[PDB]
Amino acid sequence: FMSSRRQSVLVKSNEEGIQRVLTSDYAFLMESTTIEFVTQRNCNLTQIGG
């Protein structure tokens, strides 16, 4: 799904990945130490899986 649309869904930074979750309908794939920092500074995002 991602290699078909590398222009569309893949981003350049963590910051541009969070802004597309906040605005668009998107499921950005971070690393678990910067999901814990985002979900304290912004209480409207969450960590889905394990």
Ligand X SMILES: *[C@@H]1O[C@H](CO)[C@@H](O)[C@H](O)[C@H]1NC(C)=O
Ligand Y SMILES: *[C@@H]1O[C@H](CO)[C@@H](O[C@@H]2O[C@H](CO)[C@@H](O)[C@H](O)[C@H]2NC(C)=O)[C@H](O)[C@H]1NC(C)=O
Distance CA 7, CA 34 (A): 24
Structural tokens at position 1: 């799904």
Determine, following the binding rule CB under 6 A, whether residue 25 of this chain makes contact with ligand Y: yes
The partner in contact with residue 5, picked from another protein, ligand Y, ligand X, none with C-beta cut-offs of 5 to 8 angstroms by kind, is: another protein
Q: Which residues bind ligand X (CB under 6 A)?
A: 42-44
Amino acid at 21: V
Annotated binding-site residue? 31: yes
User: End-to-end alpha-carbon separation of the chain, Å?
Assistant: 21
Contact footprint for another protein (CB under 8 A): 3-7
Contact footprint for ligand Y (CB under 6 A): 23, 25
